Amino acid sequence: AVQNVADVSVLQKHLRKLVPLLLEDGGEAPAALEAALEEKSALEQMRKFLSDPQVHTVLVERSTLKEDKEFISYNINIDIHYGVKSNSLAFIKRTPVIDADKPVSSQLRVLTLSEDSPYETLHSFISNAVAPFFKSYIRESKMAPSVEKKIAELEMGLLHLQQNIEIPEISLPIHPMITNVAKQCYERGEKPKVTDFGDKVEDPTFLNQLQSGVNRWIREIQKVTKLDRDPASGTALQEISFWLNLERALYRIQEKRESPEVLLTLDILKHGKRFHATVSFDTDTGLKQALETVNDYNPLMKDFPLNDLLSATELDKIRQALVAIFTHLRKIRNTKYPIQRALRLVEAISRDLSSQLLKVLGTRKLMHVAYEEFEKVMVACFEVFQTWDDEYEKLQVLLRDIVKRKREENLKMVWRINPAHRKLQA
Amino acid sequence: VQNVADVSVLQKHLRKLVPLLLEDGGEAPAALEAALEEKSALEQMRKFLSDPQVHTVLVERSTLKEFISYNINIDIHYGVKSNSLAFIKRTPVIDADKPVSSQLRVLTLSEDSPYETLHSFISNAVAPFFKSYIRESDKMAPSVEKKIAELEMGLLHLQQ
Amino acid sequence: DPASGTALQEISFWLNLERALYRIQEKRESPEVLLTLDILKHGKRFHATVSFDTDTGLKQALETVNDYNPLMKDFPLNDLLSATELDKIRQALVAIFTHLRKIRNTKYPIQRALRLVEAISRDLSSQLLKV
Amino acid sequence: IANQPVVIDNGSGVIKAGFAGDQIPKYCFPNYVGRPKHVRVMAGALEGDIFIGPKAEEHRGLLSIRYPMEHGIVKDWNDMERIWQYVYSKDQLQTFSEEHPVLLTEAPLNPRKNRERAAEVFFETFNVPALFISMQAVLSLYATGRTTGVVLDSGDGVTHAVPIYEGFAMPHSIMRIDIAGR
Ligand SMILES: Nc1ncnc2c1ncn2[C@@H]1O[C@H](COP(=O)(O)OP(=O)(O)O)[C@@H](O)[C@H]1O
């Protein structure tokens, strides 16, 4: 219920008096701010801001246009969009419409959206104005525990966004009372024993909650151990790096497994004669077999010469690079490499070969040279192609004897490979 | 990493910024002058501008009994009738010769409950900013946008 | 009102009632409140004691909320309100009705349950209108 | 997956239950259901109608004790539901019937409907993750540790002998009469 919808006068004065303090080194309202406020579009944006009850935000940008040394002009829009040369700003109303006979600033939620990238912008505002604020509000005391965790993992998700983790690394939560007990032993320096709970060890609800936590831990481990995607999905480096990520990530799961706190919970369930969660912690979790297959592919994934293929623009560099990569790949005779996986691997190798050759033909200006230079380049192209054919037949015979030494079955293995380079060869 | 930003620099921006966000324009009140001359607050400005492990500082607007009680507390807390206003440093190094206002991030925190308060701030300005940015211009960006909407929904239900 | 209002308000409603009554009973079972009752019983002012042990609907309230709690514990209606994918809305409908299957052990009012289903449909039409 | 299996030993006279791995059954009480006989007059009386367990045993004078199971066969399923529900109450287990697989003892030569409706009761009202109905003689020999031998039991409503050979309980030698303790 508001009968006094705020006049544009107080808002424009609030803009002129406050906004330059954030858009300058103190300073006053520039002439471009007055002309930017008197923009018919800006006036109707602020009028839709002060009149429409559903409108909450508005953007007051600090455009710094060059060669006018740079000019200072202001952009006003209700839509919020990030600028790279500008100190944008956001005004949120606490009310649906402002009653200006009180502080108009106390009915505005001035949030500064400066030129810092939105990733770290949201990270800064969350970690420094939401997590301690809202968490202190829950400290003074439900959706709130979930909201709390979403604050934490949302801001951490911005980090996952930036660094491109690609693999979920989820910690194993323990019951809080056990953490208080270990905290009490931590105040002294004593190792928190199993029988510290005493009578609490051989109780029903206690062991019940312990198995609940361990059961969720097993699901957290299995969430990422059995994970798999299409081997040809994405480029070659993506799949190869994906296997590498799985290797180090499964080692981190082993790290979370080997902590003494988790072992303390396991000791609780063992001392309480409950063998289920204890044996299932290693058997029901496929972490052991996942780590052994990871270790089988671990030297194969470390020191991969794909960079030899990255900065190779000369076809001779590509010749020697192709032979080098395949001779390093020759160690798949001892690590059980799959058939279809190797074939999609080969097509991924041909994908990057094609990409490199595409830019090579781009930087060649081949449609203007003479037949002497074009003939040399032509012969070099066929040189690379022949290195592919004969060395690929050597890899074929390699996998043939691998399947012979393994003696598994008579599958319908497709060797009718149409790679990414014959498309240009024809 | 060249110098140390004195308390007086951000004191000037506080005495010139508080009237247009915590007061009704004009001059920094007597409570703000006493709060800015507080020895505790002096240490808070020194640790906020010259100590890389202090990301926050908050300038709370508390009212008790119809009594003005301003405060400068680095740790963020909530008072029922506290129309807080914080200063958040973007970068771990704040300068004095350079503009101190173009190196920080200012943010109010009204007397409303943090449910609708943080829902209003985050849900109203974070979503169009982040969405308009990533829908212009890496891996888990739309799912983290989904997480933003989930946090938004949780605060919405905490409010109603 | 089980008829109007959002379904989420009802789920949160019963949970908040359990919290209130739980803290209430812990305040009641404190030795200080017990000793006040002991003093009144020693003073034989039975009006206070009998009225404290039978007039408050607390004993029946805890019973009723604990009978409704298994249906009310972890109701996944937020999933409809979570994703805009129509398949996610369908999966949410599936999980919600399988969670509503729990009425066999709750003795909740069937009429209130029907009104809850209609509130769910209000959420359904809301989410679909949104998407 | 679940927390831990709950071994609920039935019996026409005394039900016995607890979690698996336990040494002795921590929760044992008679398999009867007592509801009051007299008239509730004074306020502040024993609230609630159906009583099971120690409270039904204590105020024994008021109740009109009946048995829902006789000769290892359930006669009333409602009282059995309340008994099992009582087993999962705060007085006996303080758990939920959604995180525990259930081992269920059962006497031989009983009708199929016992296993069928009992399974419906568990997997539907209780929604247990896993149910397993078994004999009783096989369990008694497993409790003694040896493996081949007959088992002579006489509980409260049934009595039978099962010649067990290494676990394979010979189904063609299970004599069973209905003259037991009760
Ligand atoms: N000391 C005793 N002497 C004789 N009979 C007893 C004694 N103690 C218990 N009983 C009878 O044995 C029965 C217990 O058997 P029970 O455990 O019910 O077998 P089940 O549980 O397989 O039915 C009780 O009904 C009781 O009547």
From Swiss-Prot, chain C:
Cytoplasmic dynein 1 acts as a motor for the intracellular retrograde motility of vesicles and organelles along microtubules. Dynein has ATPase activity; the force-producing power stroke is thought to occur on release of ADP. Plays a role in mitotic spindle assembly and metaphase plate congression. The chain holds residues 265 to 395 of 4646 of the full protein. It is found in: Cytoplasm, Cytoskeleton. Changing H42R: In CMT2O and SMALED1. It comes from the Eukaryota. It is linked to Charcot-Marie-Tooth disease, axonal, type 2O: An axonal form of Charcot-Marie-Tooth disease, a disorder of the peripheral nervous system, characterized by progressive weakness and atrophy, initially of the peroneal muscles and later of the distal muscles of the arms. Charcot-Marie-Tooth disease is classified in two main groups on the basis of electrophysiologic properties and histopathology: primary peripheral demyelinating neuropathies (designated CMT1 when they are dominantly inherited) and primary peripheral axonal neuropathies (CMT2). Cortical dysplasia, complex, with other brain malformations 13: An autosomal dominant disorder characterized by global developmental delay with impaired intellectual development. Some patients show signs of peripheral neuropathy, such as abnormal gait and hyporeflexia. CDCBM13 is associated with variable neuronal migration defects resulting in cortical malformations. It comes from Homo sapiens (Human). Belongs to the dynein heavy chain family. This is Cytoplasmic dynein 1 heavy chain 1. Dynein heavy chains probably consist of an N-terminal stem (which binds cargo and interacts with other dynein components), and the head or motor domain. The motor contains six tandemly-linked AAA domains in the head, which form a ring. A stalk-like structure (formed by two of the coiled coil domains) protrudes between AAA 4 and AAA 5 and terminates in a microtubule-binding site. A seventh domain may also contribute to this ring; it is not clear whether the N-terminus or the C-terminus forms this extra domain. Homodimer. The cytoplasmic dynein 1 complex consists of two catalytic heavy chains (HCs) and a number of non-catalytic subunits presented by intermediate chains (ICs), light intermediate chains (LICs) and light chains (LCs); the composition seems to vary in respect to the IC, LIC and LC composition. The heavy chain homodimer serves as a scaffold for the probable homodimeric assembly of the respective non-catalytic subunits. The ICs and LICs bind directly to the HC dimer and dynein LCs assemble on the IC dimer. Interacts with DYNC1LI1; DYNC1LI1 and DYNC1LI2 bind mutually exclusive to DYNC1H1.
From Swiss-Prot, chain D:
GO terms for cellular component: cell cortex; centrosome; dynactin complex. Part of the ACTR1A/ACTB filament around which the dynactin complex is built. The filament contains 8 copies of ACTR1A and 1 ACTB. Interacts with dynein and adapters such as BICD2. Interacts with BCCIP (isoform 2/alpha). Belongs to the actin family. ARP1 subfamily. The chain holds residues 7 to 188 of 349 of the full protein. This is Alpha-centractin. One of its GO terms (molecular function) is ATP binding. Keywords: Acetylation, ATP-binding, Cytoplasm, Cytoskeleton, Nucleotide-binding. Transmembrane segments: none annotated. It comes from the Eukaryota. It is found in: Cytoplasm, Cytoskeleton; Cytoplasm, Cytoskeleton, Microtubule organizing center, Centrosome; Cytoplasm, Cell cortex. The keyword Nucleus does not apply. Part of the ACTR1A/ACTB filament around which the dynactin complex is built. The dynactin multiprotein complex activates the molecular motor dynein for ultra-processive transport along microtubules. The keyword Nucleotide-binding applies.
